[PDB]
Amino acid sequence: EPKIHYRKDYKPSGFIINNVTLNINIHDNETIVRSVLDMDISKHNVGEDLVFDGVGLKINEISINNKKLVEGEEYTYDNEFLTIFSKFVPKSKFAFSSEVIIHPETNYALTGLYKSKNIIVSQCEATGFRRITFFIDRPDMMAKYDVTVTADKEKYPVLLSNGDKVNEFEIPGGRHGARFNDPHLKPCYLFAVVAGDLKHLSATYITKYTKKKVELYVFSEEKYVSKLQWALECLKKSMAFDEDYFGLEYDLSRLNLVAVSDFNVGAMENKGLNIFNANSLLASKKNSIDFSYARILTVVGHEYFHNYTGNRVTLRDWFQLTLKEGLTVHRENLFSEEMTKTVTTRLSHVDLLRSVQFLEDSSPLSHPIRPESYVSMENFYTTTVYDKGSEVMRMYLTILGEEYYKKGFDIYIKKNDGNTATCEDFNYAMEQAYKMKKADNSANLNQYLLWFSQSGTPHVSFKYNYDAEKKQYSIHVNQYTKPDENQKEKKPLFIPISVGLINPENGKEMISQTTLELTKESDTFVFNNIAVKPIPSLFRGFSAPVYIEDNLTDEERILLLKYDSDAFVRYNSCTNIYMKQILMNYNEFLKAKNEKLESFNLTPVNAQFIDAIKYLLEDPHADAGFKSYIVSLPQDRYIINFVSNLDTDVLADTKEYIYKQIGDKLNDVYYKMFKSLEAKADDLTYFNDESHVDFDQMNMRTLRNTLLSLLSKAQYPNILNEIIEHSKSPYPSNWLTSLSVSAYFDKYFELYDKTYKLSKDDELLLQEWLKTVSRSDRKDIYEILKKLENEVLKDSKNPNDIRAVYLPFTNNLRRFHDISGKGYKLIAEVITKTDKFNPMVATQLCEPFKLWNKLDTKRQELMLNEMNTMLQEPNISNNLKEYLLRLTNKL
Ligand SMILES: CCCCC[C@H](CC(=O)NO)C(=O)N[C@H](C(=O)N1CCC[C@H]1CO)C(C)C
Numbered sequence: 001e002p003k004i005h006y007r008k009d010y011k012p013s014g015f016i017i018n019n020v021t022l023n024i025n026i027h028d029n030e031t032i033v034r035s036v037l038d039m040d041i042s043k044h045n046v047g048e049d050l051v052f053d054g055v056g057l058k059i060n061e062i063s064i065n066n067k068k069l070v071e072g073e074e075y076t077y078d079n080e081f082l083t084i085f086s087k088f089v090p091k092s093k094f095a096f097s098s099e100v101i102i103h104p105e106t107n108y109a110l111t112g113l114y115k116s117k118n119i120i121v122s123q124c125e126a127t128g129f130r131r132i133t134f135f136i137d138r139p140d141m142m143a144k145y146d147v148t149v150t151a152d153k154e155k156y157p158v159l160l161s162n163g164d165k166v167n168e169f170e171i172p173g174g175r176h177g178a179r180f181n182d183p184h185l186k187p188c189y190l191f192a193v194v195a196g197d198l199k200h201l202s203a204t205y206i207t208k209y210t211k212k213k214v215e216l217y218v219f220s221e222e223k224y225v226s227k228l229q230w231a232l233e234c235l236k237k238s239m240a241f242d243e244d245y246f247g248l249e250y251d252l253s254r255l256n257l258v259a260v261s262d263f264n265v266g267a268m269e270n271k272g273l274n275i276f277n278a279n280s281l282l283a284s285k286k287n288s289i290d291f292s293y294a295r296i297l298t299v300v301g302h303e304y305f306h307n308y309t310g311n312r313v314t315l316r317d318w319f320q321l322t323l324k325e326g327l328t329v330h331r332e333n334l335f336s337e338e339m340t341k342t343v344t345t346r347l348s349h350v351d352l353l354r355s356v357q358f359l360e361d362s363s364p365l366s367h368p369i370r371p372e373s374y375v376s377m378e379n380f381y382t383t384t385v386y387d388k389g390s391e392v393m394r395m396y397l398t399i400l401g402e403e404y405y406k407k408g409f410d411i412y413i414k415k416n417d418g419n420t421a422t423c424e425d426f427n428y429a430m431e432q433a434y435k436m437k438k439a440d441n442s443a444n445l446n447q448y449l450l451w452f453s454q455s456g457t458p459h460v461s462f463k464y465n466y467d468a469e470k471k472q473y474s475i476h477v478n479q480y481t482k483p484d485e486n487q488k489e490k491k492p493l494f495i496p497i498s499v500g501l502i503n504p505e506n507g508k509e510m511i512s513q514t515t516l517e518l519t520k521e522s523d524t525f526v527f528n529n530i531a532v533k534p535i536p537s538l539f540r541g542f543s544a545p546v547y548i549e550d551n552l553t554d555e556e557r558i559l560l561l562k563y564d565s566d567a568f569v570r571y572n573s574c575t576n577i578y579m580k581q582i583l584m585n586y587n588e589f590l591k592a593k594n595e596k597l598e599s600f601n602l603t604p605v606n607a608q609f610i611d612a613i614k615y616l617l618e619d620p621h622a623d624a625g626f627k628s629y630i631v632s633l634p635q636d637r638y639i640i641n642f643v644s645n646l647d648t649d650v651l652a653d654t655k656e657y658i659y660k661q662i663g664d665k666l667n668d669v670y671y672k673m674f675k676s677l678e679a680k681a682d683d684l685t686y687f688n689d690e691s692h693v694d695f696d697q698m699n700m701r702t703l704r705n706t707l708l709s710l711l712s713k714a715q716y717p718n719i720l721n722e723i724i725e726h727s728k729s730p731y732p733s734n735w736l737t738s739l740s741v742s743a744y745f746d747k748y749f750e751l752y753d754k755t756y757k758l759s760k761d762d763e764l765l766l767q768e769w770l771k772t773v774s775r776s777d778r779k780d781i782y783e784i785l786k787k788l789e790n791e792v793l794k795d796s797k798n799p800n801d802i803r804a805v806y807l808p809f810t811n812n813l814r815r816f817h818d819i820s821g822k823g824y825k826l827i828a829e830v831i832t833k834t835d836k837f838n839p840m841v842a843t844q845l846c847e848p849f850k851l852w853n854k855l856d857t858k859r860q861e862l863m864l865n866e867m868n869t870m871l872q873e874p875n876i877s878n879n880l881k882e883y884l885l886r887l888t889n890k891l
């Protein structure tokens, strides 16, 4: 809650920075940064003081045009802003020079310049460049960079910054230097530097259309150079995809990707020098679980795609974040759907959005994808801006279709290349394409802007009529968004509804798929020549980011699950059956608890639904990934969107009942499929080949591991033998599952020791092991956390370690939410501890408190007490204070 920046207040700077010439001299106990800004006065200038951002800098010298400026007389510096009084600021082109001292060796917040293990590395987005040197540190201040880095040669043999390496030189005293020129105008947030004893793999890529030769290097510490192979393949895939779908080619002679051990987020798109959390760049089949492959593909792609949507077209201001992030996520999703060719890839996104993003959008943190105000920009790198952003960017492709979408996208890139841009710029481009598609210059996408400005998730509900004799069917649709703090009156959105109509007698499609365009609060869509009463297949591919109220019977939903063509509608039909059941049994258990009944009834799971699950499971031509979705209940964070004053214990009992009802019918089926899938699931074709992954085979393993979990909880006879055997697989996805599912057996602690010994000498694998323990369904999980703290985590400041120990545990419904509040106290203590050195990670660890006002009134109180205690810690960070104030309804 200090200074609050507002979106309508945007004004261009009174100043211009045209070039940046940096020298960065790294020493053991200090790094010295000399910087010349070649600057000018803008047409917006009104003779104001020249104010630079600069945070924690120790000033050696400051000058303008070779004249030394002095503290008190010519400048003030308060550790956050440097003010050059106007009477000493020139009125035409001038050279500002500064030299400062910084200390990456003691920078544990991992913003600005820092040391990660033995690598020196920067992270500048959003406001980190000001921790390196003085700057007008905002994205519309675009300049060209000339960067020299020096260091001890033995410790830091490899020196990297943005763009072309133009010189390498030796320095007396065992030092060396490298100079880089980046020809592309950029904002400072895309500046990067790395120095280290790095090893690499490389390739040359030739661009499709202009035949530009591009050198591709991927880098890590020596211990893990062999884990770089997949990344380099993913980069080549990415490049090809942007050329093939978007006609976009890379624009420098060289592209480097670098892994570092300590990183607050996944990776960063610094021009020509993308930097990664090692967990999102490094893998090997012997030392990584499966999910690493899709992770790396996603993150390499995402950061590559930013070359156009973020770097060549950048942001005017930070309120426009979703323009680069939503759009880049949508680009990556298209890429990943094309690379994987599995329906589970779209389903995984939808599952994330409806759980994590819907929760945010009904919390006190709710915001539109283009926010109106902020305090710490770091708090607005949200699932809203990324995920709901991406669904907003995706709806344009749904509305326009592939050809006109690619047209609109080209107009956007062409118009804004080399410049900053706003969300309205993108909409205007898509609007040009829309007019072309409707053949009508009066068509507009003004209404579509409300996807940017209006917060909250729309609810879309349905009523059906069929006239048997006229062969006529109608779908009446209503949309509603719940008023909130951002808008007391909500407006109808442009909602695309992809639909099919299934004949329930034969399972066949009755119409060409079509996209209904709902733009009013309600509308009735009518279909002729509908030969029988259909079942509607609604929101195919999850065509808009909404709460779908299908108004279907379970019988109808079963028919969709079995016979519809669309993976999402099939999965959603299943999800809705589960949700009806959960809500019903939750209410039954809740009445029992509150009225202290001695006896009561529970509604049984629909038997035909069960049969339908069985039929799907036993179908050898049905997709293994899809099957894993059908046997899993909806996520807790999805469910909670449907329940007020949620008693988490009652929910836990509800889920256990339902899983047991299903298992009591299907466990023999589960076991037969677990055994029959083994040959194809665990086949070792390509186990030595890091350039190729079979994602279908991976989904077979996921299914096997899901079934093993289900069978383990049920205590299926002799399943312990199957778990033991599974712990000998060469696939870490399997042997870490073995640990997980062994939670329900006396052998857990044997498998804990065994898998720890298998994980401990690979830092990323050890982190996957920590996650596995943390997520284990153990009665003694609090004592197991203490053991991790004492034996493994200890004093680590590595965010991947901290996150791995605590975050999975916070998803343990029964234990995290223990009615004592001990879980809440435990995570609050970790947040407070962590905020003292890394505020961004501290705010990340507050994730489980986002649903506090959705819980039962005792749990609500217990969470609020912990948040209020954290807010009382002295020297709480602005990141964490802002976050908690907003979450608790004070800001
Ligand atoms: C998923 C998109 C690609 C990953 C990289 C993005 C960062 C980004 O936008 N780079 O350009 C990120 O870290 N995003 C966050 C992220 O992946 N996080 C933040 C903490 C670590 C990591 C999840 O474990 C998500 C949660 C928004």
Ligand SMILES: [Mg+2]
Pocket: 261, 763, 798
């Ligand atoms: Mg470590």
Ligand SMILES: [Zn+2]
Pocket: 302, 306, 324, 325, 328
């Ligand atoms: Zn991004």
